[PDB]
Design an enzyme around this catalytic site. Structure first.
Site, PDB file in Angstrom:
ATOM      1  N   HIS A 147       0.809  -1.225   0.000  1.00 45.40           N
ATOM      2  CA  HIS A 147       0.000   0.000   0.000  1.00 45.40           C
ATOM      3  C   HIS A 147       0.855   1.296   0.000  1.00 45.40           C
ATOM      4  O   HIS A 147       0.294   2.382  -0.117  1.00 45.40           O
ATOM      5  CB  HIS A 147      -1.084   0.017   1.103  1.00 45.40           C
ATOM      6  N   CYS A 162       3.487   1.330   9.672  1.00 43.98           N
ATOM      7  CA  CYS A 162       3.359   0.272   8.667  1.00 43.98           C
ATOM      8  C   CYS A 162       4.724  -0.239   8.243  1.00 43.98           C
ATOM      9  O   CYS A 162       5.666   0.540   8.125  1.00 43.98           O
ATOM     10  CB  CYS A 162       2.549   0.750   7.467  1.00 43.98           C
ATOM     11  N   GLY A 179       2.538   5.882  10.431  1.00 45.23           N
ATOM     12  CA  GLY A 179       3.938   5.689  10.078  1.00 45.23           C
ATOM     13  C   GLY A 179       4.532   4.373  10.545  1.00 45.23           C
ATOM     14  O   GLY A 179       5.681   4.066  10.219  1.00 45.23           O
TER      15      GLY A 179
HETATM   16  O1  LIG Z   1      -4.081   2.475   9.013  1.00 41.10           O
HETATM   17  C1  LIG Z   1      -2.967   2.663   8.531  1.00 41.10           C
HETATM   18  C2  LIG Z   1      -2.769   2.969   7.057  1.00 41.10           C
HETATM   19  C3  LIG Z   1      -3.730   2.220   6.163  1.00 41.10           C
HETATM   20  C4  LIG Z   1      -5.045   2.639   6.014  1.00 41.10           C
HETATM   21  C5  LIG Z   1      -5.940   1.923   5.243  1.00 41.10           C
HETATM   22  C6  LIG Z   1      -5.527   0.771   4.600  1.00 41.10           C
HETATM   23 CL1  LIG Z   1      -6.668  -0.116   3.643  1.00 41.10          CL
HETATM   24  C7  LIG Z   1      -4.214   0.342   4.733  1.00 41.10           C
HETATM   25 CL2  LIG Z   1      -3.687  -1.140   4.004  1.00 41.10          CL
HETATM   26  C8  LIG Z   1      -3.318   1.067   5.499  1.00 41.10           C
HETATM   27  N1  LIG Z   1      -1.829   2.519   9.231  1.00 41.10           N
HETATM   28  C9  LIG Z   1      -1.575   2.695  10.605  1.00 41.10           C
HETATM   29  C10 LIG Z   1      -1.029   1.636  11.325  1.00 41.10           C
HETATM   30  N2  LIG Z   1      -1.125   1.468  12.648  1.00 41.10           N
HETATM   31  C11 LIG Z   1      -1.743   2.410  13.339  1.00 41.10           C
HETATM   32  C12 LIG Z   1      -2.293   3.583  12.774  1.00 41.10           C
HETATM   33  C13 LIG Z   1      -2.822   4.669  13.519  1.00 41.10           C
HETATM   34  N3  LIG Z   1      -3.239   5.808  12.975  1.00 41.10           N
HETATM   35  C14 LIG Z   1      -3.159   5.928  11.640  1.00 41.10           C
HETATM   36  C15 LIG Z   1      -2.679   4.953  10.808  1.00 41.10           C
HETATM   37  C16 LIG Z   1      -2.222   3.729  11.361  1.00 41.10           C
END
Ligand SMILES: O=C(Cc1ccc(Cl)c(Cl)c1)Nc1cncc2cnccc12
Ligand SMILES: O=C(Cc1ccc(Cl)c(Cl)c1)Nc1cncc2cnccc12
Ligand SMILES: [Cl-]
Lengths: 305, 301
Positions: free
Chosen positions: B41, B145, B143
């Site tokens: 992504h 990921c 951030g």
């Molecule tokens: O949620 C996303 C980005 C994201 C969003 C939608 C999709 Cl479909 C995908 Cl694959 C990735 N990563 C984040 C990771 N962990 C905690 C998070 C807290 N706050 C924000 C982002 C966070």
């Protein structure tokens, strides 16, 4: 989101762990520059521990009696000296993996990461707090002596703890890296007991702020309290006194969540007098006190090392 | 003595964390040999999240669009390919700090350490378990990921998780290192929800054995139960069914403490019925399920 008991990345410390053997005893040492630090009780036999004269035992030792092993390479000891309850073994080779470091003595309530080691090899990392009774509730087996506690500030490792022993109740005692014990403990086989422990109040408040940042608000109330009224209540429940320093330290969390420290103190007072009523805070049915206000800000804002 | 939630030392993994930038998106990558693994992504824009066609978006990218940074050194991307939901960026330098490693896909109930990273820099290490609903209850911010989950039994790192997203309830979803998601999740902004989570029964039993090894015996009782009667009770408290595999896995702990698995199951049934009554087990007022039978043996013996 999420709130976890989180330790500092242990890499900078793993590159310092070595195995120190003296006679039949094998424990861990911390190799920084050309010095290996380890508990001085490594020189003791089972009888020597009952009433040891460490100066007398050390004068009888030669450099070749200490077998220091860094990975699969044997280091040669070229000198030995004692600083309080730590033995300093001068080696011929300076550790190429020596990080930027400092030796710091911490106060009760402060947290640090422990890199549990056996035979100079790291096996686990966990986060813990220096209890108000100067013990740590660690997880250590035989051979864990010399394992170290640390914090990281930017790229600098602050070594704050070296493991020496386990008390009869299963709690742990140790020293700073200058060999000074935390608490009224001695490195001698005698009757020693941890004093009655208390709850680290400022840390519980910091954890309640972490719960608010994570969406847990059920314990919040409309009430506030005076610092003196809170301390009178807190003392009744074996909680550490909350000082103006603690109120000031919690300031940034108070500003972020919109809950004044004395307002959060009134939530804590009600939690103490009424319990949780089958509810949990951050997945816990007990009030957690091993997250400082700095740990909460670091975790809820993502500081890196 | 003592029982702590313990993570593996993170050093071997810290030397693999890099920052991967593509357009306006920056996340973490895992640099092993001459390959950087990261969530696919990272190539997605604003309108490429509801229904992204990753093959289509990737074909439009060139190697120079991927900015990989290892510390303060920029790595040169010489190739890119996609394996399921992970992007593999071939680089011109092999990581000199690459440890002995394997990619392992874990099952629910299994535990692992997470090295939370931001901008390719490690900020913390914590212990997790793969929930029965295939999510993890992590601690991640924007951030994070590309942060990875791992186990280090011996000198080999078994990579089992790569963080991809946070679900609406605050729980986390991700893939193994082959890009296959854990759970029925997709790397799309479409409506997705974690199923109702359950307690990892075998892990709670392993933790009750840890408490017995540590001298905590108050919850023990004179009763035993049949496996079926235990499961009928357990499911009413949203506990996972305990299988014969789980009873077998608990054998060594059963032998060490002298408490039969079905005897410990009856203690667990009683705890579910009465609660703890102001008492704690290993410093906890709740039944802990993020220690496997393997974790308990490793930590206690
Ligand atoms: O949620 C996303 C980005 C994201 C969003 C939608 C999709 Cl479909 C995908 Cl694959 C990735 N990563 C984040 C990771 N962990 C905690 C998070 C807290 N706050 C924000 C982002 C966070
Ligand atoms: O208890 C000792 C040795 C020891 C004994 C007496 C004295 Cl006075 C001193 Cl200074 C050191 N270290 C151990 C450390 N941690 C956990 C342990 C579990 N089991 C056994 C030992 C453990
Ligand atoms: Cl597994």
């Amino acid at each position: 989101s999420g709130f976890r008991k989180m330790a500092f990345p242990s890499g900078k410390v793993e590159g310092c762990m070595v195995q120190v053997t003296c006679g039949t005893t094998t424990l861990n040492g911390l190799w920084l520059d050309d010095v290996v630090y380890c508990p001085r009780h490594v020189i003791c036999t089972s009888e020597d521990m009952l009433n040891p004269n460490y100066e007398d035992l050390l004068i009888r030792k030669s450099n070749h009696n200490f077998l220091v092993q860094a990975g699969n390479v044997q280091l040669r000891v070229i000198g030995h000296s004692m600083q309080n309850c730590v033995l300093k073994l001068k080696v011929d080779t300076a550790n190429p993996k020596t990080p930027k470091y400092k030796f710091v003595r911490i106060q009760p309530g402060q947290t640090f990461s422990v890199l549990a080691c056996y035979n100079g090899s790291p096996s686990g990392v966990y986060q813990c707090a220096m209890r108000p009774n100067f013990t740590i509730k660690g997880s250590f087996l035989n051979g864990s002596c010399g394992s170290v506690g640390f914090n990281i500030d930017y790229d600098c490792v602050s070594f704050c703890y070296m493991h020496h022993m386990e008390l009869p109740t299963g709690v742990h005692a140790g020293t700073d890296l200058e060999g000074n014990f935390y608490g009224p403990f001695v490195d001698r086989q005698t009757a020693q007991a941890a004093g009655t422990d208390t709850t680290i109040t400022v840390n519980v408040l910091a954890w309640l702020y972490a719960a608010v940042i994570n969406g847990d608000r059920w314990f919040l109330n409309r009430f506030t309290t005076t610092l003196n009224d809170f301390n009178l209540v807190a003392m009744k429940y074996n909680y550490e006194p909350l000082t103006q320093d603690h109120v000031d330290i919690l300031g940034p969390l108070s500003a972020q969540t919109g809950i004044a420290v004395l307002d959060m103190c009134a939530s804590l007072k009600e939690l103490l007098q009424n319990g949780m009523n089958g509810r949990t805070i951050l997945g816990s049915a007990l009030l957690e006190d091993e997250f400082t206000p700095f740990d909460v800000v670091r975790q809820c804002s993502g500081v890196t090392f």
